[PDB]
Design a protein around this ligand. Structure first.
Ligand SMILES: *[C@@H]1CC(=O)N(CC)C1=O
Ligand SMILES: [Cl-]
Ligand SMILES: [Cl-]
Ligand SMILES: [Cl-]
Ligand SMILES: [Cl-]
Ligand SMILES: [Cl-]
Ligand SMILES: [Cl-]
Ligand SMILES: [Cl-]
Ligand SMILES: [Cl-]
Ligand SMILES: [Cl-]
Ligand SMILES: [Cl-]
Ligand SMILES: [Cl-]
Ligand SMILES: [K+]
Ligand SMILES: [Mg+2]
Ligand SMILES: [Mg+2]
Ligand SMILES: [Mg+2]
Lengths: 218, 230, 238, 222, 196, 204, 239, 221, 5, 230
C-alpha cells in the first residue's frame, strides 16, 4: 500500500494505489483506499484492511450524528480526536494507519494517524509499505502553496514511486481533491499498469458431468 | 400502605408481631430437659383420615445429638431446618467436633430479621414458625426455644403452639430438676392429652428423645403404644 | 415508592388477576379475528380496523404476520404490544432452527411466548401485554394446527375459534356450522365469510384473509388478493 | 428490578396473598387422586367446547417416566411449575443416577412454591398439585402440594372446585373393598367426580408408565 | 486409545466400541461401555479426554430426555446431532471446551437410519460408515473396500468382525473385547460382544 | 496452519447476466479424508449463494448464524436481501469476532433480486469485503485457482461458457492440492433458473 | 398532601420536605461564626440535657481538614455524616491535586452533596446547617455556611439555630474586619450568653474553636484558659 | 433509585388512560400536515424569538425527515434515537434504512415507555416521510407505538377538521409542487408568514427543509 | 374464568 | 383543570395531557424574587440581573447569579439557588467533555440543547423532581455572531434577540418587544421593577466579537453605564 496527502494553496490532495495483497499474492487489483468521512473530509487507509474499513465507517457515522445535531459542517480536528482516542483505547490492536485530510471553517488540515493512537499535523504525509518511496518524492519536490495541478502531479508521482518500487503496491492511482469550492474524487486518476494481450485462444461438453439438477425460478 | 420494616408507636416491628401471632395457629409442641436427656413431643393434628399420618413431620433430626420440634407455618420451617443441618456439618468439617445446641440455635436465629425490600428476591417477610431445639453436648442435655423475632433462650420445659399458655402452666407444676427422663416423657404425654382437640393415640402424636447415652431417637408406633398404655 | 405502585402482579381477594382481566376487556374491543382448521389447510380471517380512505397500505398485510416458513399469526388487542410479541416469536423460531436445524413445532413456539406473558403476571411489577393471538401452522408431528393464547399466558388448540369483538357470537355460529373432520379450505372460507357477516357491524376492504397450505412438501402462506375476497359474492347467493 | 414485598403478614398471622392463591385453586377444575393396592389413578373435570383440540388442554402431565401429576388453579402457573419439576427430575438422574422418588420431586415442588411466598417482587403460584407414582420397592404413592408449599401423602384426595364435597365422599367410600381391584379403583374416581360434575382419566401401574384412557373406555364406566 | 465404529445399512445402523478403560500402562477396566442411550432409537458414542467425555455425553442425554418430557415426543436423530454440535461448537472458544469425538447413530420413522460423525472441533458430517480412534486408520480402508449401501445386517456384522480382527493383527494396543449394538424401527438391540 | 486443517476450496465467477459458484466436496482431518460430500455452498435466497472454505466447524457455524440473521431480516423487511447487503451483514458477523475470529473466508455469488445484475465478492476471516467484476477464490489452493482464473476468464461469458470456465479452473487447481478435491459441485445462477452439477473428478 | 417527598413540588412551587428539615435546624441551639482580621472564630451554645454527660460530650465543632473547622446545628447524626463527607472530600482533593483544598471549593462540593438529597423520594434532606471556616496567608480568612437545601454563601458573620435572628443583631454591631481573634472569642462568648434563653433552657456549655494567623492556619479548640476568660467576660457583661 | 413498576396500567374497561392522556397532549399541540404526492412527500407545521434557532421539521438521514405534534422536548428525544437507529442500521447493512424500518424501530421505543418502570409515555405523534425503492412514504407514529401509513393526514389542534379538508382536496395523481400548495392551505384553515411555518420536502434528491425564501414564494400563490 | 382449570 | 390519581404528585399526564409537576417547577423559579434580562446585538451579548444583599453579614462577593461555564460562555441563573448551582456544574462538565472529545469549543446552542435534554428526563421519569431554575447562556459564535439562549424546567430551549426570566418576565418581554445593548438591558430591568439602580444592586456580564471571553463588570464599570444613562 502507498497512501499520501499534501496541503496545497487551496486545500488537500489525497492519493492511493489500488493493490490489496494476501501474503505475497495480489487479491484485489482495484481496491479503493480513499474512504468517505464526511462531504468535506476523506481518509486514506493502510494496515489491517478490515480495521481501517470498520474504523473509518464508525467515525463517519458518528460525525454524521454530530453534524445532524450541530447543523454545521464537521471539523477535521473532530475526526482526528475521535479516531485517536478510540485507537489509543485499543492499544494498537486495531491496525488502522490513516491519512486524514479535509477542509473546514478553519481551512485545510492534514493528519497522519497511527494504530497506537499518535497523530501528526503536517503539510505532507505518507503511509503503507510504499511510504518511504512516496516520501522521497515529497522531500525532493514539495513546495508550500502549490497550485491544484502541481499538487495533483506531486501526489501521483509519490504514489507511482510506491507502485514501482514496493512489492506491496501496484495497479492504479486514485486522487481526491478537496477545496472550499469542490471535491474531485478521481478514481482512477492514472492507469500505469495494464495486462498484456493474450497470444493464444482457449467447447460445450469438454467437462464431464456426473449429476445435474435444474431448478426453475419465479 | 406501610413497609415491612416499620416501627409502631410502641417501638415494635409490625411484621414480627404478626409472625408471632401465626405460632398460635400451630399445633402444640412440648420439650422437657432432664439430667438424663431431653424429650420432644408434638401434636400432629390430623385434619382427615385420608391423610397419611407419617407424612406429617414436626420433629426432625438436625444431627445425631440434636432434634427439633416446630410449630406454626410448617413450610417456612423447612428452610430453617436445612440451615441448621448444613451449619452443624460445616462446623464438623472445619473444627472436627460437634456443634453445641446453643451454637446451632444461634446460627438459625441469625436468619431472622434478615428481611426487607432493600436483593434481588431476598426474604420479604419473617418466618412464621417457632422451634424447640433439644440435644446433648458437653454442657449436658439442653433445650432451647426460638421464635420469629430471632430471640432464643434455654428452657427447662417449654410449650409452643395454640395451647402453650395452658400447657406451660401444667409444666411449671410438674417439672423438677431431679426429674427422670421417663417421668418427663409421661408428663408431656399427659399434658398433650388434655390440651389436644382430638383423642390422643399412637398415630396422631410424635415423640423423640436425645440422651447422653444414645443418638436422636424417634419413637416407633409400638414404642408410643407402650408409653400410652398407662 | 410504595405510594405510586399500582401492584400489577398481585392476587385479588377472590384469587383473580385484575390486570389480566382488564387486558382481556381491551381485546374484546379489538377487531374481530377468527381461525378455522380444515383437512387441506388453515385460514385466518381478520377485520381491518384501518378503514380510513386516506390510508396508504404499504405492507402485504395489516394484522397477519409471518413467523417462520411454516407459521403465521394474527392478533387482537394493543397493536404496539403485538409488535413486541410477534418480533419475539420470530426470534424464538430462529433460535430453535439454529439449535436443531429443523423448524420449531407449532405448540413449542406458542408455549415459549406464553412463558414470557406468564412472567409478566407473576413478577417484575409491569403491566401485562394486552394481546390475544391466533396461530396457524404445519409441522411434521401434528400437521395443520390452530392455537390461541391470551394475556395470562394460557393457550389451547382449536379446530375453530374467534378473538376480539363479538367473539362470543362468532363461537356460537362455529359450533353450529363447523363439520368436525369434514372441512375443506373452500367450505372453511365460506363459513368464515358467513361468521364475519354477522359479527361485523361487509366489504372486501374491511376484511383480510390468509390461508396456509402444503404444496410439494413445502408450506405456502398467502394473503388473498382483493379480487379473491368473489368469496363475498358467493355467500350472498346463499 | 422490582423488589416490593408482595406476600406479607396481616394482623392475625395470615398471609393474604397465599390465601388468595388458594382461592385461585378453588376456581380450578376438580382433580381427584386415589392410591390403590398396585395402581394409582388421577381424574380431572374438563371445562370444554366441541371445537377444541383435546390433546392440547390436558390437566394430567408426566414429570418423569415414573412420576406424573394433576393440577387445579392457574393453568399458566401450572405449566411453569411442571417444566421446573421436569428439569429437576433430569438433574437428579444426572447426579444420583437413580430416578426421583415421588416424595423427592414433591418436596422440590413444595419448596419452590414456598419460596414464592417469601421472595420480593413475586406473587405465589396459584395451583395445587396431586403427584402420583411408584417407588423402587413398588410402593404406590400420592402426594398433594398447595400454594403455601405444604405437602402431605394421601390415600385419596381432591383439589379444585368442590374439593370439600369430593373429599367427604372419599372419606366414606375409601375402603379395602373399593381399592380391591383395578376396575373398582378407577370407578371410585369417576364416582367421586360425578359428585360435582366431560372427564379425563389416567392410570399408572407398577413400572409400566402413564396410560391415558380413551373416551370410549370412559363412556363404559359412566 | 478408544475405538468407535458405525455402519449404516438400508433400515438399520450397527455400532461398536472397545470396552477398555486405560490409565498409563494398565487396563483398569475391560467391560467399559462407551455408548449412551439418548432416546429409544438414538445412541451417542463418545471418546476423548477423561472427565470431558462423560460430562458432555450425560449433559446431552439429560437434555434429549428433557425434550421428550416437555413435548411428548422425541428428537429426531438429525435434530439430536445438530443439538449436540451446537453445544460443542458453542463451548469451543469458551472457558470450558470439551475434548470429545462422537458418533451419533439413530433410526427415524420417516427418514430411516442415520449415522453422524463429529470431531472435537464440532464439525458434523453424515456418513454411511465412520470410525474414531487410532484404530480407524487401520479399518476405514476395509470398510471402503467391502461396504455397499444395501449391505444386510448379517454382512455388516461380519464386516465389523473383519475390522476388529485387523486391530488384533496389526494394532499395537490391546483391545480384546467390543460392545456391539444395532438400531432399527424396533429400537436399540444389544448384540453379543465380539471377543478375542 | 489452522486454515489448512480441513482443507477446501471455493470460487465464484461473473458472466453476462449470470454468476457461478463452485466448491470441492472433501471433508478431511489433516491427511485423512472423512467424507466426500461435505456442503460448503449454502443458499441465502433464490438467486444468492455463499460458499465458505476454512475450518469445517466454522464453515457450518457461520452458515447457520448467517441464516439466523437473514431469516429475521427478511421477515422484518418483507423483501429478499440484495447481494451487497448480505456482504455487509457477513462482514458485520465476522468483525464481531475480531479478537477471536471464525476461521472461514467466504465468497458470495448472486443476482440482484430486482435488477438481476451479477454480483460476486469475498471476505477475509475478520470481514474485510472485496467486490470484483471477474472472479474470487478462497481456500488452501488459492494460488492454483488464481493461475487458472487469470488464464481462462473472459468478460461477458454466456451460462455455458461460464460453466466450462469455472469447472476447468476448479478441477485443474484442486488437482495440484493434496487437501482439496474428492469432487466438485457447481451452481450456475440465472434469472430464470439454477443449474446444479457435480463434475467427474479425481478421487485422490 | 404535597409535603411527603422531596421529589414533589407543591402547587406554589415549594419543596416542603426541605423546609421541614430546616425546621429541625431552627429547633437546635445556636452556633455562630465570625470572620475577623486574621482568622475565623466559632462558638456553640451546647445545651446540657443531663448532668450525667461528660464535659465534652456531643461536640458540635469538628476538624474536617487541618486548616478547616466546621460548626453544626440540627440533627447531630446527620451533621456527623456531613463532617465525614467533608473530610473525605478534603482528603481526595489533596490526593488528586496535591495541595490543601480551598475553603470555597470544599463548601461548593459538600453543598452539592447536600443538594443531591433534595431531589428524590429515595432519600430525605439533611436536617442540619453548618459553617466552614479556614485561614491561610494566600486566601485570608473565609467563612461559609450551608443549609439543608444545599445553598452556600460566604459571610463576615453568621448564626444558625433557634436564636439566629437575635444573634445576627448582635454580630452586626461588631466591626469584625478590624478586630483580632483574641477580641472575637470574647464577643462570641458574649453573644451566646445574650441569646441564651435562661428561663426555657437551663445549663449549657460554651464550645469555642478558631483558625487564624495565631494558630498558623490550623483549626484548633480555643485554649481552656482563654475560654474561661471569655466566659467570665460574657458573664460580667450580662450583669 | 428508579421505579420498577409501570405507570401505565389497564383500567377496568380495558383502557390505558396514560396513553389517552398522552393523545390529549398531542391534540393540544400545534397543527402538523403530511401529504404524499406522486413524486414526493411534504411536511408542514405551525410555529423576540429567533425562529431559525430551533426547528420542528428535522432530517433523520439524507432521505428521511420528521415533524411532530405535541410536546417539543419529548420530540427531541425521539429525533436523537431515530438518528441513532438509522446509523446503527447503516453500519450493519451499509445501506440507508428504509423509511418503514425506521418507523418500526422508533415506534418500538415509544412502546417501551408505555410499559417500562417509572416512566410516562411520550406526549408526541410523529409524521415521518422518506424515499426508497423509487417510491415516497408517509407514516404516523402515536404515543402507544402504533404506526400507520398515510396518503395525507393532519395532527394537533383542529386535526379532525384538517383531515376532512384534505379528503376533499387530495388526489393520487397530484405532484409535489401542488402538494406543497394544498398543505399550506390546510394550515391556513386553523391559523401567516414564512417565519411562523416550517415546510420540509422529500423526493429522489432526498429530504430537505424549504428555505424561508422558498416558503415566501409559495405564500405568493 | 378462561385462565383457570 | 381536572386531575386524576397522582398527576399532581409525579410527572404523569393529567386528563387534558398536562404535567402539573412541571408547571409547579415554573412557580419555583419565582420563589427567588429576582428578575434577569439578556439582550444581543451585532457586536455583543449582555446579561443583567438583580443583586439583593439584605443581610450585610453576607460577603457580597460570594453572592452572584453570574457564572463562567467556559472562558467564552457565561450564564445567568434564575430560580432556586442550589438547583441553579447544580445545573451550572453540569453545564461546565458537558462543555469540558465536549472540548475533550471533539477538539473545539461547544457552541452555545449545543450546550443549551444538552442542558434542555437533561431537563427533559426529569419530566418523564417519576422518581426525581425537575429543577426549579432557569438558565440563560451568552457567547460569540464564529459564524453567527453573539448568541443568547435560554432553557427552562420543561426542557424547552430557544435562541433570542432578547429575553428575560424570573418575577417580571412578562413585563420585561413586553418592554423588549416594543424596542425591537448594555443600556437596553439595564433600562428594561429598571422599568419593570421601578427601581433606578445603585452600581451594587445589579450584576452585568458581557461577551463581545472583539473580546469573546466572558467578562463580569466591576462596580466602577457598571457605574459608568448608570451615570451615562442618567
Ligand atoms: C423554540 C423558540 C422558538 O421560537 N421556537 C419555535 C416557536 C421554539 O420551539
Ligand atoms: Cl487533536
Ligand atoms: Cl501496508
Ligand atoms: Cl407459642
Ligand atoms: Cl424460517
Ligand atoms: Cl436414571
Ligand atoms: Cl383445593
Ligand atoms: Cl449470531
Ligand atoms: Cl444482521
Ligand atoms: Cl420499585
Ligand atoms: Cl440529535
Ligand atoms: Cl435539512
Ligand atoms: K419527575
Ligand atoms: Mg509494486
Ligand atoms: Mg478442560
Ligand atoms: Mg486434490
Amino acid at each position: 500500500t502507498t497512501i499520501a496527502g499534501v496541503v496545497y494553496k487551496d486545500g488537500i490532495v489525497l492519493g492511493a494505489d489500488t493493490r490489496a495483497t494476501e501474503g505475497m499474492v495480489v487479491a484485489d487489483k482495484n481496491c479503493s483506499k480513499i474512504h468517505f468521512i464526511s462531504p468535506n473530509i476523506y481518509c486514506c487507509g493502510a494496515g489491517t484492511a478490515a480495521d481501517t474499513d470498520m474504523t473509518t465507517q464508525l467515525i463517519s457515522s458518528n460525525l454524521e450524528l454530530h453534524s445532524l445535531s450541530t447543523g454545521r459542517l464537521p471539523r477535521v480536528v473532530t475526526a482526528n480526536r475521535m479516531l485517536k482516542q478510540m485507537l489509543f483505547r485499543y492499544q494498537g490492536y486495531i491496525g488502522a494507519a490513516l491519512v486524514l485530510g479535509g477542509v473546514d471553517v478553519t481551512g485545510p488540515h492534514l493528519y497522519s494517524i497511527y494504530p497506537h493512537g499518535s497523530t501528526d499535523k503536517l503539510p505532507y504525509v505518507t503511509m503503507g509499505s510504499g511510504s518511504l518511496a512516496a516520501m522521497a518524492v515529497f522531500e525532493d519536490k514539495f513546495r508550500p502553496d502549490m497550485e491544484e495541478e502541481e499538487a495533483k502531479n506531486l501526489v501521483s508521482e509519490a504514489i507511482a514511486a510506491g507502485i514501482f518500487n514496493d512489492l506491496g503496491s501496484g495497479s492504479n492511482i486514485d486522487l481526491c481533491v478537496i477545496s472550499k469550492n469542490k471535491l474531485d474524487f478521481l478514481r482512477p486518476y492514472t492507469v500505469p499498469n495494464k495486462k498484456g494481450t493474450r497470444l493464444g485462444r482457449y467447447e460445450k461438453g469438454t467437462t464431464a458431468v456426473l449429476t445435474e439438477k435444474i431448478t426453475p425460478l419465479e | 400502605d406501610r413497609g415491612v420494616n416499620t416501627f409502631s408507636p410502641e417501638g415494635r416491628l409490625f411484621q414480627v408481631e404478626y409472625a408471632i401471632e401465626a405460632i398460635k395457629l400451630g399445633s402444640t409442641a412440648i420439650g422437657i430437659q432432664t439430667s438424663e436427656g431431653v424429650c420432644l413431643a408434638v401434636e400432629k393434628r390430623i385434619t382427615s383420615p385420608l391423610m397419611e399420618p407419617s407424612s406429617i413431620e414436626k420433629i426432625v433430626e438436625i444431627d445425631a445429638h440434636i432434634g427439633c420440634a416446630m410449630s406454626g407455618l410448617i413450610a417456612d420451617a423447612k428452610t430453617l431446618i436445612d440451615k441448621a443441618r448444613v451449619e452443624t456439618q460445616n462446623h464438623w468439617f472445619t473444627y472436627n467436633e460437634t456443634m453445641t445446641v446453643e451454637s446451632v440455635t444461634q446460627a438459625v436465629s441469625n436468619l431472622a430479621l434478615q428481611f426487607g425490600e432493600e436483593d434481588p428476591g431476598a426474604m420479604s417477610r419473617p418466618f412464621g414458625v417457632a422451634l424447640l431445639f433439644g440435644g446433648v453436648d458437653e454442657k449436658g442435655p439442653q433445650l432451647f426455644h426460638m421464635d420469629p423475632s430471632g430471640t432464643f433462650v434455654q428452657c427447662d420445659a417449654r410449650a409452643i403452639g395454640s395451647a402453650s399458655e395452658g400447657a406451660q402452666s401444667s409444666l411449671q407444676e410438674v417439672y423438677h430438676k431431679s426429674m427422670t427422663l421417663k417421668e418427663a416423657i409421661k408428663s408431656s404425654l399427659i399434658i398433650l392429652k388434655q390440651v389436644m382437640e382430638e383423642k390422643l393415640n399412637a398415630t396422631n402424636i410424635e415423640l423423640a428423645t436425645v440422651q447422653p447415652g444414645q443418638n436422636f431417637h424417634m419413637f416407633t408406633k409400638e414404642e408410643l403404644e407402650e408409653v400410652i398404655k398407662d | 415508592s410504595r405510594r405510586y405502585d399500582s401492584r400489577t402482579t398481585i392476587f385479588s381477594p377472590e384469587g383473580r388477576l385484575y390486570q389480566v382481566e382488564y387486558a382481556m376487556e381491551a381485546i374484546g374491543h379489538a377487531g374481530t379475528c377468527l381461525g378455522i382448521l380444515a383437512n387441506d389447510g388453515v385460514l385466518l380471517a381478520a377485520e381491518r380496523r384501518n378503514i380510513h380512505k386516506l390510508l396508504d397500505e404499504v405492507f402485504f398485510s395489516e394484522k397477519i404476520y409471518k413467523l417462520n416458513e411454516d407459521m403465521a399469526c394474527s392478533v387482537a388487542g394493543i397493536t404496539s404490544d403485538a409488535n413486541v410479541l410477534t418480533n419475539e416469536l420470530r426470534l424464538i423460531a430462529q433460535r430453535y432452527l439454529l439449535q436443531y436445524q429443523e423448524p420449531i413445532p407449532c405448540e413449542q413456539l406458542v408455549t415459549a411466548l406464553c412463558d414470557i406473558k406468564q412472567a409478566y403476571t407473576q413478577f417484575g411489577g409491569k403491566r401485562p401485554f394486552g394481546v390475544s393471538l391466533l396461530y396457524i401452522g404445519w409441522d411434521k408431528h401434528y400437521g395443520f394446527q390452530l392455537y390461541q393464547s391470551d394475556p395470562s399466558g394460557n393457550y389451547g388448540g382449536w379446530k375453530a375459534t374467534c378473538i376480539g369483538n363479538n367473539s362470543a357470537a362468532a363461537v356460537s355460529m362455529l359450533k353450529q356450522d363447523y363439520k368436525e373432520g369434514e372441512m375443506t379450505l373452500k367450505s372453511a372460507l365460506a363459513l368464515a365469510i358467513k361468521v364475519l357477516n354477522k359479527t361485523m357491524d361487509l366489504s372486501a376492504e374491511k376484511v383480510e384473509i390468509a390461508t396456509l397450505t402444503r404444496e410439494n412438501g413445502k408450506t405456502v402462506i398467502r394473503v388473498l388478493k382483493q379480487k379473491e375476497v368473489q368469496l363475498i359474492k358467493k355467500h350472498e347467493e346463499e | 428490578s422490582y423488589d416490593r414485598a408482595i406476600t406479607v403478614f396481616s394482623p392475625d398471622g395470615h398471609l393474604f396473598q397465599v390465601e388468595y392463591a388458594q382461592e385461585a385453586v378453588k376456581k380450578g377444575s376438580t382433580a381427584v387422586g386415589v392410591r390403590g393396592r398396585d395402581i394409582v389413578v388421577l381424574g380431572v373435570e374438563k371445562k370444554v367446547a366441541k371445537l377444541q383440540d383435546e390433546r392440547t388442554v390436558r390437566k394430567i402431565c408426566a414429570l418423569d417416566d415414573n412420576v406424573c401429576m394433576a393440577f387445579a388453579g392457574l393453568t399458566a402457573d401450572a405449566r411453569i411449575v411442571i417444566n421446573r419439576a421436569r428439569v429437576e427430575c433430569q438433574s437428579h438422574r444426572l447426579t444420583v443416577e437413580d430416578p426421583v422418588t415421588v416424595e423427592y420431586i414433591t418436596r422440590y415442588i413444595a419448596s419452590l412454591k414456598q419460596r414464592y411466598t417469601q421472595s420480593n417482587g413475586r406473587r405465589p403460584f396459584g395451583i395445587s398439585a396431586l403427584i402420583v407414582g411408584f417407588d423402587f420397592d413398588g410402593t404406590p404413592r400420592l402426594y398433594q402440594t398447595d400454594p403455601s408449599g405444604t405437602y402431605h401423602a394421601w390415600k385419596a384426595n381432591a383439589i379444585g372446585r368442590g374439593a370439600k364435597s369430593v373429599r367427604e365422599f372419599l372419606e366414606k367410600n375409601y375402603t379395602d373393598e373399593a381399592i380391591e381391584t383395578d376396575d373398582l379403583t378407577i370407578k371410585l374416581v369417576i364416582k367421586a367426580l360425578l359428585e360435582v360434575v366431560n372427564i379425563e382419566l389416567a392410570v399408572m401401574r407398577r413400572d409400566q408408565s402413564l396410560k391415558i384412557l380413551n373416551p370410549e373406555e370412559i363412556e363404559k364406566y359412566v | 486409545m478408544e475405538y468407535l465404529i458405525g455402519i449404516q445399512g438400508p433400515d438399520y445402523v450397527l455400532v461398536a466400541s472397545d470396552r477398555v478403560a486405560a490409565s498409563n500402562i494398565v487396563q483398569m477396566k475391560d467391560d467399559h461401555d462407551k455408548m449412551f442411550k439418548m432416546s429409544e432409537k438414538i445412541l451417542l458414542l463418545c471418546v476423548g479426554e477423561a472427565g470431558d467425555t462423560v460430562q458432555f455425553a450425560e449433559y446431552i442425554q439429560k437434555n434429549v430426555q428433557l425434550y421428550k418430557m416437555r413435548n411428548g415426543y422425541e428428537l429426531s436423530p438429525t435434530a439430536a446431532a445438530n443439538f449436540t454440535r451446537r453445544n460443542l461448537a458453542d463451548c469451543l472458544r469458551s472457558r470450558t471446551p470439551y475434548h470429545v469425538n462422537l458418533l451419533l447413530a439413530g433410526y427415524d420413522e420417516h427418514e430411516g437410519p442415520a449415522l453422524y460423525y463429529m470431531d472435537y472441533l464440532a464439525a458434523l458430517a453424515k456418513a454411511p460408515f465412520a470410525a474414531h480412534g487410532y484404530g480407524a486408520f487401520l479399518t476405514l480402508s476395509i470398510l471402503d473396500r467391502y461396504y455397499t449401501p444395501t449391505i444386510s445386517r448379517e454382512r455388516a456384522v461380519e464386516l465389523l468382525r473383519k475390522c476388529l480382527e485387523e486391530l488384533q493383527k496389526r494394532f499395537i494396543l490391546n483391545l480384546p473385547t467390543f460392545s456391539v449394538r444395532i438400531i432399527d424401527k424396533n429400537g436399540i438391540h444389544d448384540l453379543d460382544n465380539i471377543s478375542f | 496452519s489452522i486454515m489448512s486443517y480441513n482443507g477446501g476450496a471455493v470460487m465464484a465467477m461473473k458472466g453476462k447476466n449470470c454468476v457461478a459458484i463452485a466448491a470441492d466436496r472433501r471433508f478431511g482431518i489433516q491427511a485423512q479424508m472423512v467424507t466426500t460430500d461435505f456442503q460448503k455452498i449454502f443458499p441465502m435466497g433464490d438467486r444468492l449463494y455463499i460458499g465458505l472454505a476454512g475450518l469445517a466447524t466454522d464453515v457450518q457455524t457461520v452458515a447457520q448464524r448467517l441464516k439466523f440473521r437473514l431469516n429475521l431480516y427478511e421477515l422484518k423487511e418483507g423483501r429478499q436481501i440484495k447481494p451487497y447487503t448480505l456482504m455487509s451483514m457477513v462482514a458485520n458477523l465476522l468483525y464481531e469476532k475480531r479478537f477471536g475470529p471464525y476461521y472461514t473466508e467466504p465468497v458470495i455469488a448472486g443476482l440482484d433480486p430486482k435488477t438481476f445484475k451479477p454480483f460476486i465478492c469475498s471476505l477475509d476471516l475478520i470481514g474485510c469485503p472485496m467486490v470484483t467484476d471477474d472472479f474470487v477464490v478462497s481456500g488452501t489452493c488459492a494460488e492454483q485457482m488464481y493461475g487458472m482464473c487469470e488464464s481462462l476468464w473472459e468478460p461477458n461469458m454466456d451460462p455455458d461458457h461460464l460453466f466450462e470456465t469455472i469447472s476447468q479452473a476448479m478441477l485443474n487447481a484442486v488437482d495440484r492440492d493434496a487437501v482439496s478435491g474428492m469432487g466438485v459441485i457447481v451452481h450456475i445462477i440465472e434469472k430464470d433458473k439454477i443449474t446444479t452439477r457435480t463434475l467427474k473428478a479425481r478421487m485422490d | 398532601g404535597y409535603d411527603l417527598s422531596a421529589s414533589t413540588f407543591s402547587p406554589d412551587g415549594r419543596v416542603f420536605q426541605v423546609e421541614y428539615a430546616m425546621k429541625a435546624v431552627e429547633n437546635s441551639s445556636t452556633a455562630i461564626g465570625i470572620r475577623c482580621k486574621d482568622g475565623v472564630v466559632f462558638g456553640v451554645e451546647k445545651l446540657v440535657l443531663s448532668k450525667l454527660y461528660e464535659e465534652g460530650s456531643n461536640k458540635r465543632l469538628f476538624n474536617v481538614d487541618r486548616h478547616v473547622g466546621m460548626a453544626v446545628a440540627g440533627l447531630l447524626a446527620d451533621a456527623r455524616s456531613l463532617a465525614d463527607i467533608a473530610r473525605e472530600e478534603a482528603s481526595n482533593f489533596r490526593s488528586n491535586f496535591g495541595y490543601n483544598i480551598p475553603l470555597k471549593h470544599l463548601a461548593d462540593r459538600v453543598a452539592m452533596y447536600v443538594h443531591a438529597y433534595t431531589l428524590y423520594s429515595a432519600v430525605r434532606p439533611f436536617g442540619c446547617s453548618f459553617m466552614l471556616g479556614s485561614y491561610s496567608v494566600n486566601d485570608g480568612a473565609q467563612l461559609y455556611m450551608i443549609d439543608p437545601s444545599g445553598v452556600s454563601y460566604g459571610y463576615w458573620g453568621c448564626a444558625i439555630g433557634k436564636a439566629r435572628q437575635a444573634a445576627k443583631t448582635e454580630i452586626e454591631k461588631l466591626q469584625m474586619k478590624e478586630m483580632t481573634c483574641r477580641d472575637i472569642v470574647k464577643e462570641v462568648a458574649k453573644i451566646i450568653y445574650i441569646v441564651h434563653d435562661e428561663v426555657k433552657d437551663k445549663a449549657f456549655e460554651l464550645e469555642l474553636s478558631w483558625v487564624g494567623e495565631l494558630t498558623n492556619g490550623r483549626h484548633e479548640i480555643v485554649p481552656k484558659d482563654i475560654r474561661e476568660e471569655a466566659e467570665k467576660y460574657a458573664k460580667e457583661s450580662l450583669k | 433509585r428508579g421505579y420498577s413498576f409501570s405507570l401505565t396500567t389497564f383500567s377496568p374497561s380495558g383502557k390505558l388512560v396514560q396513553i389517552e392522556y398522552a393523545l390529549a397532549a398531542v391534540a393540544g399541540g400545534a397543527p402538523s400536515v403530511g401529504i404524499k404526492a406522486a413524486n414526493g412527500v411534504v411536511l408542514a407545521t405551525e410555529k423576540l424569538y429567533d425562529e431559525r434557532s430551533v426547528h420542528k421539521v428535522e432530517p433523520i438521514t439524507k432521505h428521511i425527515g420528521l415533524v411532530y405534534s405535541g410536546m417539543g422536548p419529548d420530540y427531541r428525544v425521539l429525533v436523537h434515537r431515530a438518528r441513532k437507529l438509522a446509523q446503527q442500521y447503516y453500519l450493519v447493512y451499509q445501506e440507508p434504512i428504509p423509511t418503514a424500518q425506521l418507523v418500526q424501530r422508533v415506534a418500538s421505543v415509544m412502546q417501551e415507555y408505555t410499559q417500562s418502570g417509572g416512566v410516562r409515555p411520550f406526549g408526541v405523534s410523529l409524521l415521518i416521510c422518506g424515499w426508497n425503492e423509487g417510491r415516497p412514504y408517509l407514516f404516523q407514529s402515536d404515543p402507544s407505538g402504533a404506526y400507520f401509513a398515510w396518503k395525507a393526514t393532519a395532527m394537533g389542534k383542529n386535526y379532525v377538521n384538517g383531515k376532512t379538508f384534505l379528503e376533499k382536496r387530495y388526489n393520487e395523481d397530484l405532484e409535489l409542487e401542488d402538494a406543497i400548495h394544498t398543505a399550506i392551505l390546510t394550515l391556513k384553515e386553523s391559523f401567516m408568514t414564512e417565519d411562523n411555518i416550517e415546510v420540509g420536502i422529500c423526493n429522489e434528491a432526498g429530504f430537505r427543509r424549504l428555505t424561508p425564501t422558498e416558503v415566501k414564494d409559495y405564500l405568493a400563490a | 374464568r378462561s385462565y383457570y382449570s | 383543570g381536572s386531575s386524576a390519581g397522582f398527576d399532581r404528585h409525579i410527572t404523569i399526564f393529567s386528563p387534558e395531557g398536562r404535567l402539573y409537576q412541571v408547571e409547579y417547577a415554573f412557580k419555583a423559579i419565582n420563589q427567588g424574587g429576582l428578575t434577569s434580562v439578556a439582550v444581543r446585538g451585532k457586536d455583543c451579548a449582555v446579561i443583567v440581573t438583580q443583586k439583593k444583599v439584605p443581610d450585610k453579614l453576607l460577603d457580597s462577593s460570594t453572592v452572584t447569579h453570574l457564572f463562567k461555564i467556559t472562558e467564552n460562555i457565561g450564564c445567568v441563573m434564575t430560580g432556586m439557588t442550589a438547583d441553579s448551582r447544580s445545573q451550572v456544574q453540569r453545564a461546565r462538565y458537558e462543555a469540558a467533555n465536549w472540548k475533550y472529545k471533539y477538539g473545539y469549543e461547544i457552541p452555545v446552542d449545543m450546550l443549551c440543547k444538552r442542558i434542555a435534554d437533561i431537563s427533559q428526563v426529569y419530566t418523564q421519569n417519576a422518581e426525581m423532581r425537575p429543577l426549579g431554575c432557569c438558565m440563560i447562556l451568552i457567547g460569540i459564535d464564529e459564524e453567527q455572531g453573539p448568541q443568547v439562549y435560554k432553557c427552562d424546567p420543561a426542557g424547552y430551549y430557544c435562541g433570542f434577540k432578547a429575553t428575560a426570566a424570573g418575577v417580571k418576565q412578562t413585563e420585561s418581554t413586553s418592554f423588549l418587544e416594543k424596542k425591537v445593548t448594555v443600556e437596553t438591558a439595564i433600562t428594561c430591568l429598571s422599568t419593570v421593577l421601578s427601581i433606578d439602580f445603585k452600581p451594587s444592586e445589579i450584576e452585568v456580564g458581557v461577551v463581545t466579537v472583539e473580546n469573546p471571553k466572558f467578562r463580569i463588570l466591576t462596580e466602577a464599570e457598571i457605574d459608568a453605564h448608570l451615570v451615562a444613562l442618567a
